Subunit: 334 residues, 4 copies
């Protein structure tokens, strides 16, 4: 029995080898951006509304042509077999059963076709490959397998400096591989190549500048994820939650605006929604649940988040996620 | 001998079973809103006035047609027999003797008629029941028993997620019951039903949004309590003290504006007054005093608060609570 | 050898009985205003100027018709025999020798005439007595003894709630008495009575509201001390340093504007000057020095402060205190 | 193997005598300005750009007529033989090999001619001497030896009060001397004398006021270093990083604007650049590396900083330092 996401972190910390826990937990550099993701959420307070009709409270949203049970998707996290032997299959099954989109990674430890076969209308996260032709072939594989959106990660020209991994001498165990294989930096030209190659919605993950959000809309993106990559890329990058309101105003409904980084409760989902997010991604907590108890762990996490989201929405007077987006917020201290 | 409200918390902590102390102390979720109630008060500084006539300093106010000895009432707190065998009767007797209004709860552990028989011109807190007819019958009981105001709690469509209570497996002992009995979410329609059923002032407790405060006035409320329910309802709800000034400006004398959450001294009462509150509610400290020493404990607490309020008002140059409302404040750090 | 004021606090803490140290160190209530005096100074940063002529750096000021060696006076502190057997005489001698004004207290433990006989052109602090006639007789005594200013304390209608003193059961030892004797709250009428009774400058100590500063000028005050009484009066009163800039702007050279509360270095004196203060008062540190080493201790403290003030002024490009008043500041964090 | 600058501080702390470590680490007074240099950087967050061309990322700049490999120079630090027997020669050799300017000190423990003979196009830091003639002779020596800029330190009319050094009784060992010899306060007249005596760019180090930055341009300075001297001069001086943006706007390209104080990573270099700095100086970390491992230590530090700067720039979408200067920032908390 878990009553908060923090219960799952404690359980994952028990079970995982230290170096693997550090791979999961860590950020780049001094971990300033990692810590700031939490600090930034903790400073946001919601102004709830009272006395509204709550006879049909629903946490559902429509996004990228699909109904989702919550305004949430599982974030792309590479190499999930590091955390449990069933890896991506356990997580994708739990996500499917919960009605939550699952993001299949370019660096998945089980092939994208196997994970897509689980069902649940999955998304696919793209890292740009050595050339256009191979990148587009990977997009086409994902589309052929029934993925419903391409989440193009745009904040990784290369991987950040993860000092925990350097100090630990961390490397993949021989039994964990990039199962989609037997990279070069993305540009706006890469985005255009992807957009022309698929009719699936293209979602740019890792946008923080307002003008990059605008340009994403102009480039034909169906969504963006406002994100500092969980503090794993540029150390000192602003948290996504701190740019979200400005970005939502700037795109002016031109694309879906998601956010990630440090979402650890249904209350945090509500804060994100109140700042204007269409939905959130959740990364580390899903992996804690996977490490702790496999598929059943992830199921319990998603059930817990669903109850927390419903609870927060109703206490704030919101019968729908749209209503939650119209909530006001106030910044506080600590 | 107690010289601060904090002396009473230490005494209550000694005597109470852990699970009962946690029921009393706790908040919802991560307890962010619970902590913020204190943080928010600690950031407020008063700009005192000097050299004013203090020859007849009075802490009295007129509210809901009654003189009160202090700008304070005892907050509604369910199930007071959890804290002392005399429960609500001990607290109501001490409040009566101090000239402070006592709020009788829907979930009182002694019947509202018994508590009202104590005297002291009590108020009645309403939770909306399964239907209109039963809710209105409860209002009529309170009115028939001589209650002078209906404090309609509007922030509890359901009870929040209290993780201390979940972790402790807390439940009422068999010897504590809801003595008014042998609930459904409130709406603005419920408010209207209550307003039409009684000539008593209706006070909406748990308002945080400015437009909800305005709407409360438009709905015929005689007062509101600006409140996040002591951090026990929405985790991440703004503290009432942070919304109070804006709300006072918006209602523009159209109803009484009370505040609660974290009031722990006469100095805090002064801060609330200087931000525009008509009066405060005090919850947890009253229960600490009850746990520590029964009726006499509550008497000592109210005597201590009375002396602190008088002290703070005079040091700030205020011969009346009205003068205290005209004090200016300045936000500081930590 | 002491190299900071903090060295003196450690020495005083060694020697003094605990209850006496607490009488000296403590504030009212939760000590929020006591702590805030320090916090507020620590948030202020100076923008120093470079490359100015420093060939005749002087820390002198003219104030209330007298040259002072530093922009500083010893604050009124009652009952100095609590800290050392020579009490006020030791402090007044050291102040005289340093060229710093000494404020003789109404509640001095040596008679005001004895302390004035030390020399050094002293000031006299007044508490308003039971009636006008006795109050004015005390003012006349001070004037007859050669005091040069009347520092009328206006923030003590009564003494604040000092919880350390209550918890310790603190009372004066039989060997410490109010030597000026064998009180009622001051008002603006009291100020006028004093102003009409003496041609000495009347200085109102304990002003925090801007309109009280204006009114002080209109009332014929020669100065004010912007002060929360070292956090010993209203708990939650804003620090003087936080009101100082606004007050200086409002009085627009109409009277001298001093500040006190938490001045613990020459750097802090510079901050106060840069915010517009004419001079500061220093309280607790003078008593630490007295406790630690009597007259010689106070001499060493004043020599240390003189060197720190000279150092700070020159490093900031200021050849005079007037130049220091023209420095700009910037608020920072922690 | 060092993966952060903090690894080098730990190593230096191991090896150095305590009093020498304190000479290096310490600041003046309470060390408020020392701590604030770090706090101020930690509050700055970068808004990175995505999807830009990074096929030729370069960290090079042109400054004072020379290409530098990074937007960084080694700060002037007196008496480097305190930290390692090779002192300035070890540091200058490593700087030369890394393509980073090295600032030769007036108070170098090896003669300026010997250090200049190392090569690498060095700068020379000037303290104003007892008269104009001797000061100008020192400038001429530096110029004759091939120094390329005169870094005139303008924040040291005298040295600040370093309480660690006072408490330790610190003095130079007999084997460390001011090798350029067998001082008076600088003014704007001194600056003019230097400017007329050399065609080398004159760089004023220790500017914090906006009008001093303007005046520096008007005086013919080729650059300024916005700096509080690592918190070693005025205790309470604003950090340079907090004045940098305002100063950059005010000089409006009229001179190079460098900053120092607390730069401890390539991420911090990026923050400085994004606030408008042309380049940074790095002081203490270079000495940590020197203490830890001599010339090879300094080489490793500069290689580490080069990799961190390249990493941060690319992750932020900047192919050049000019692009980094066009990044936006956002202030956060803690
Ligand atoms: C171990 C780990 C691996 C990750 N791998 C990827 C990846 O392959 N692609 C990607 O776009 N994001 C990746 N992310 C970033 C997440 O998608 C997400 O942005 C971040 O974890 C969200 O923050 P949260 O973990 O605080 O919920 C990874 C994060 C972690 C912790
Ligand atoms: C144990 C407990 C029970 C409570 N029960 C009720 C209730 O039945 N109805 C209600 O409107 N508020 C209830 N409250 C909220 C209080 O009325 C009040 O809003 C809150 O406690 C004020 O904060 P304070 O405790 O910080 O003074 C309760 C609070 C506590 C701590
Ligand atoms: C032990 C003690 C006694 C004091 N007595 C008096 C007094 O008799 N009259 C008065 O105007 N202020 C009195 N003060 C206040 C000081 O004059 C001054 O406002 C305060 O101490 C300044 O702060 P500092 O102690 O932080 O320097 C007293 C302060 C202390 C600590
Ligand atoms: C031990 C030490 C000696 C210094 N000596 C000088 C000096 O002789 N001349 C000068 O202009 N600055 C001097 N500085 C200041 C540095 O040039 C620089 O402004 C400061 O150290 C930059 O901060 P950082 O150490 O945080 O990188 C010295 C600093 C230290 C720590
Ligand atoms: O994307 C990531 O943050 C990440 O940690 C990673 C590192 C190496 C391979 C794949 C993902
Ligand atoms: O940093 C890298 O080289 C790396 O492994 C990578 C991973 C994913 C996308 C781009 C680069
Ligand atoms: O109102 C409350 O906060 C509360 O704690 C409660 C919980 C259960 C029943 C009654 C009150
Ligand atoms: O959460 C509940 O179901 C509950 O017990 C309750 C209590 C008071 C009012 C409304 C609901
Ligand atoms: O003025 C004071 O703060 C003070 O502490 C005091 C208390 C009693 C008598 C005199 C002064
Ligand atoms: O609080 C008091 O009664 C008190 O002792 C006093 C002391 C000085 C001035 C006014 C009152
Ligand atoms: O410039 C300095 O900060 C410094 O520490 C110093 C002190 C004495 C001599 C030379 C430099
Ligand atoms: O403070 C001093 O006297 C000192 O040593 C010095 C050092 C360098 C420049 C100016 C003064």
């Amino acid at each position: 029995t878990y009553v908060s996401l923090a219960d799952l972190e404690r359980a994952a910390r028990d079970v995982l080898p230290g170096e693997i826990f550090d791979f999961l937990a860590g950020g780049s550099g001094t971990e300033a951006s990692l810590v700031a993701n939490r600090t930034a959420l903790e400073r946001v307070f919601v102004i709830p509304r009272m006395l509204r009709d709550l006879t049909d409270v629903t946490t559902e949203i429509d996004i990228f042509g699909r109904r989702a049970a919550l305004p949430m998707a599982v974030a792309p996290v590479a190499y999930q077999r590091l955390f449990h032997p069933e890896g991506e299959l356990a997580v994708a099954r739990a996500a499917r059963d919960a009605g939550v989109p699952y993001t299949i990674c370019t660096l998945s430890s089980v092939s994208l076709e196997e994970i897509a076969a689980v069902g649940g209308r999955p998304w696919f996260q793209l890292f740009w490959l050595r050339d256009e032709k191979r990148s587009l072939d990977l997009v086409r594989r994902a589309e052929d397998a029934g993925c419903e959106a391409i989440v193009f990660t745009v904040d990784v020209p290369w991987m950040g400096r993860r000092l925990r991994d350097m100090r630990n001498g961390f490397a993949l165990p021989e039994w964990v591989t990039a199962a989609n294989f037997d990279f070069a930096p993305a540009t706006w030209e890469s985005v255009e190549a992807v957009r022309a190659h698929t009719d699936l919605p293209v979602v740019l993950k890792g946008i923080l500048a307002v003008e990059d959000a605008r340009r994403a809309v102009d480039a034909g993106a169906g969504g963006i994820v406002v994100s500092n990559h969980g503090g794993r890329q540029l150390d000192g990058a602003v948290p996504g939650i701190e740019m979200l309101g400005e970005i939502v105003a700037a795109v002016s409904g031109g694309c879906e605006v998601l956010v990630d980084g440090g979402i650890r409760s249904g209350g945090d989902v509500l804060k994100a929604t109140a700042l204007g997010a269409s939905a959130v991604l959740v990364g580390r907590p899903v992996m804690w649940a996977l490490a702790a108890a496999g598929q059943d762990g992830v199921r319990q996490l998603l059930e817990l988040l669903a109850e927390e989201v419903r609870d927060a929405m109703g206490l704030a007077g919101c019968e729908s996620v749209g209503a939650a987006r119209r909530l006001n917020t106030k910044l506080g201290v600590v």
